[PDB]
Scaffold this active site. Structure first.
Site, PDB file in Angstrom:
ATOM      1  CG  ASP A 214      -2.027   1.273   1.293  1.00 58.04           C
ATOM      2  OD1 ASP A 214      -2.503   1.708  -0.008  1.00 58.04           O
ATOM      3  OD2 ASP A 214      -2.494   1.593   2.231  1.00 58.04           O
TER       4      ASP A 214
ATOM      5  NE  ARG B 291      -3.627   5.756   0.259  1.00 56.70           N
ATOM      6  CZ  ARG B 291      -3.622   5.599  -0.835  1.00 56.70           C
ATOM      7  NH1 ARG B 291      -3.438   6.003  -1.789  1.00 56.70           N
ATOM      8  NH2 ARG B 291      -3.690   4.075  -1.036  1.00 56.70           N
ATOM      9  CG  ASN B 292       0.239   4.600   3.642  1.00 51.87           C
ATOM     10  OD1 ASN B 292      -0.488   4.773   4.513  1.00 51.87           O
ATOM     11  ND2 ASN B 292      -0.640   3.903   2.593  1.00 51.87           N
TER      12      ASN B 292
ATOM     13  CG  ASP C 134      -0.278   2.867   7.484  1.00 54.92           C
ATOM     14  OD1 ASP C 134      -1.201   2.217   8.547  1.00 54.92           O
ATOM     15  OD2 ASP C 134      -0.216   4.026   7.285  1.00 54.92           O
TER      16      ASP C 134
HETATM   17  N1  LIG Z   1       1.558   8.406  13.182  1.00 56.50           N
HETATM   18  C1  LIG Z   1       0.662   9.569  12.611  1.00 56.50           C
HETATM   19  N2  LIG Z   1       0.864  10.576  13.113  1.00 56.50           N
HETATM   20  C2  LIG Z   1       0.517  11.535  12.559  1.00 56.50           C
HETATM   21  N3  LIG Z   1      -0.528  11.386  11.669  1.00 56.50           N
HETATM   22  C3  LIG Z   1      -0.678  10.142  11.232  1.00 56.50           C
HETATM   23  C4  LIG Z   1      -0.120   9.337  11.685  1.00 56.50           C
HETATM   24  N4  LIG Z   1      -0.587   8.044  11.105  1.00 56.50           N
HETATM   25  C5  LIG Z   1      -1.544   8.490  10.181  1.00 56.50           C
HETATM   26  N5  LIG Z   1      -1.620   9.757  10.328  1.00 56.50           N
HETATM   27  C6  LIG Z   1      -2.774  10.513   9.370  1.00 56.50           C
HETATM   28  O1  LIG Z   1      -3.650   9.830   9.326  1.00 56.50           O
HETATM   29  C7  LIG Z   1      -3.949   9.612   7.733  1.00 56.50           C
HETATM   30  C8  LIG Z   1      -4.649   8.499   7.185  1.00 56.50           C
HETATM   31  O2  LIG Z   1      -4.175   7.161   8.024  1.00 56.50           O
HETATM   32  P1  LIG Z   1      -4.323   5.959   7.347  1.00 56.50           P
HETATM   33  O3  LIG Z   1      -5.318   5.067   8.058  1.00 56.50           O
HETATM   34  O4  LIG Z   1      -3.038   5.606   6.796  1.00 56.50           O
HETATM   35  O5  LIG Z   1      -5.101   5.955   5.801  1.00 56.50           O
HETATM   36  P2  LIG Z   1      -4.341   6.275   4.428  1.00 56.50           P
HETATM   37  O6  LIG Z   1      -3.101   6.040   4.719  1.00 56.50           O
HETATM   38  O7  LIG Z   1      -4.767   7.759   4.332  1.00 56.50           O
HETATM   39  N6  LIG Z   1      -4.940   5.328   3.470  1.00 56.50           N
HETATM   40  P3  LIG Z   1      -4.685   3.886   3.474  1.00 56.50           P
HETATM   41  O8  LIG Z   1      -3.665   3.953   2.415  1.00 56.50           O
HETATM   42  O9  LIG Z   1      -5.905   3.379   2.923  1.00 56.50           O
HETATM   43  O10 LIG Z   1      -4.219   3.483   4.584  1.00 56.50           O
HETATM   44  C9  LIG Z   1      -2.718   9.854   7.176  1.00 56.50           C
HETATM   45  O11 LIG Z   1      -2.665  10.388   5.804  1.00 56.50           O
HETATM   46  C10 LIG Z   1      -2.228  10.973   8.087  1.00 56.50           C
HETATM   47  O12 LIG Z   1      -2.647  12.188   7.636  1.00 56.50           O
HETATM   48 MG   LIG Z   2      -1.805   3.599   5.962  1.00 52.84          MG
HETATM   49 MG   LIG Z   3      -4.324   2.917   7.120  1.00 51.58          MG
END
Ligand SMILES: Nc1ncnc2c1ncn2[C@@H]1O[C@H](COP(=O)(O)OP(=O)(O)NP(=O)(O)O)[C@@H](O)[C@H]1O
Ligand SMILES: [Mg+2]
Ligand SMILES: [Mg+2]
Ligand SMILES: CC(C)n1c(Nc2ccccc2)nc2cnc(Nc3ccc(N4CCN(C)CC4)cc3)nc21
Ligand SMILES: [Cl-]
Ligand SMILES: [Mg+2]
Lengths: 297, 297
Positions: free
Chosen positions: A134, A138-139, A152
């Protein structure tokens, strides 16, 4: 072993949603150590809907054991009720939001250094025999603007299966094959997001159409700031034959070489004026935020 | 090395809570906003009691450069300064606060291994300053911060110079204003006595004006209830009238490390057997969240 703290629900509290994805919802949270009076900010990912706790735990130890400056480690877990994963809070947020926010202020030095750093972390996952599945802008999290980390990996594995068609290698789309070389294709798409300052890939092409266009040989367009040498690397990440694709260890080398002469490889208006931090500024940021970069010649 | 000290504009940070005060100024929790970013990064800000001229200010800066050059895991480094009409010192925020408050708040609930290890760490920090030929002049449990319960750091280095705590001072400092590494050793012995009493006030019931007289007559702080004779003798040797009869910080490190290897032999604490001591799992979690820096018996 000692790498994964098993948390009790009393220990932490979720305060505010930061985002959400295919796999779960991320909260800014607080950890309250037992016997203490302090509240320590953390990020907590609450996973969507299967697997016995022993199995999840087995998978969680692997996530807790990654040790690389460009890869976020799982720090703790709580699996009483849902599965909640505890990790370091990154106040800068993800690199996709960051590049959009700063599209008028990001220089060739930053862009090529992030490409190196993301390739470094993915090379580490490959060393560890771990396939991400993935990878996307965004990750990738921003710990400081100078320092990003992949997050992730292996959630895809843990939860099984919002499917990220537009980042996936052709073989993953058709045959559900996921390898380190399919991760290379996603890295290619990730570099494309960075160099366009956060454009949405194939915008206005429904997801259903993607395999078809790729099969025809269509690909993402050359970002206007990219010299052809940059764009050629992305195109190589998107060859039909997995094994033709560059390897992460090669991408580290190639981007590190470009980062030495960055204005040779990216054309950005006013780039001469966007440079990495002074030693003065870098020492300060690290002290505050990053106690845990390739310059031009 | 000027790169070690960041000079800040008043516009890039704000004060948000008072944390305490001392004889040199008021300490605030503040937030630093990197210019052009949306994040708010917590810092500690000490604002000096004295508003000062541009001239005095240059004296201040040359001393600030020294404070910012301090590089040791057991001494806090000055990160930044703002030369507002009121001089402001920026330094990392420690959510646990000072060790004096910590041992009072956990007063009969701290094990011998922690107490001995803090004494090792504070001597390591002071030895580093002695190596650099720097004298602290104001060591006290109030000027040791807790970064995690496993890692303490001396703070306030340089302040006493920049701008008196009689009950912590060597006799020669009280009588003649002589301050040396061996007067810092006297203060270290009082600091240890603070910690071993769980934060008792030294010479309570005796006015400061009368302290030199009692010292001259050979009176000393008494043997804390938990301290065996071996530990108490170390403290007493810190308070010898002849400064060169006092221990060196290098000897202190050795002696307290030895004791830390068998802590129950040297401190006798009711319920010591059941006190918390830190598992590797709990230490990895604190370090990942709060203590990334390169640093226990
Ligand atoms: N450890 C963190 N510290 C600060 N922000 C975070 C952190 N982890 C995740 N985020 C924020 O949360 C958002 C989305 O989280 P996430 O659940 O990873 O969905 P995603 O990555 O956008 N999509 P997906 O690819 O489906 O996981 C990220 O894009 C960041 O904006
Ligand atoms: Mg993720
Ligand atoms: Mg996620
Ligand atoms: C207030 C002093 C001890 N201090 C200096 N001092 C300092 C010295 C020179 C330059 C900058 C700061 N730097 C500090 C950095 N951090 C913290 N932390 C911190 C301090 C106090 C508290 N609390 C919460 C509990 N309350 C019972 C009391 C107030 C919580 C966290 N203090 C600092
Ligand atoms: Cl702290
Ligand atoms: Mg203090």
């Amino acid at each position: 072993q000692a790498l994964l703290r098993i948390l009790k629900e009393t220990e932490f509290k979720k305060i505010k949603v930061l985002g959400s994805g295919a796999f779960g919802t991320v909260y800014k949270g607080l950890w309250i150590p037992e016997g203490e009076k302090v509240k320590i900010p953390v990020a907590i990912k609450e996973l969507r809907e299967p697997k016995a706790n022993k199995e999840i735990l087995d998978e969680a130890y692997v996530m807790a054991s990654v040790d690389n400056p460009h890869v976020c480690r799982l720090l703790g877990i709580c699996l009483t009720s849902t599965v909640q994963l505890i990790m370091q809070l990154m106040p800068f947020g993800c690199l996709l939001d960051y590049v959009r926010e700063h599209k008028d202020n990001i220089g060739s030095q930053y862009l090529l250094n992030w490409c190196v750093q993301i390739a470094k972390g993915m090379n580490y996952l490959e060393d560890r025999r771990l396939v991400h599945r993935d990878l996307a802008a965004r990750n990738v999290l921003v710990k400081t603007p100078q320092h990003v980390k992949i997050t992730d990996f292996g959630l895809a594995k843990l939860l099984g299966a919002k499917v990220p068609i537009k980042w996936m290698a052709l073989e993953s789309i058709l045959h559900r094959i996921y390898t380190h070389q399919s991760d290379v294709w996603s890295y290619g798409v990730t570099v494309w997001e960075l160099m366009t300052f956060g454009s949405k890939p194939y915008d206005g092409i429904p997801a259903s159409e993607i395999s078809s266009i790729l099969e025809k040989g269509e690909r993402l367009p050359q970002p206007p700031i990219c010299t052809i040498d940059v764009y050629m690397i992305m195109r190589k990440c998107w060859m039909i034959d997995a094994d033709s694709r560059p390897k992460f260890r090669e991408l580290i080398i190639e981007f590190s070489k470009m980062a030495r002469d960055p204005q040779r490889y990216l054309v950005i208006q006013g780039d001469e004026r966007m440079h990495l931090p002074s030693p003065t500024d870098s020492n300060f940021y690290r002290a505050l935020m990053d106690e845990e970069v390739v310059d031009a010649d």
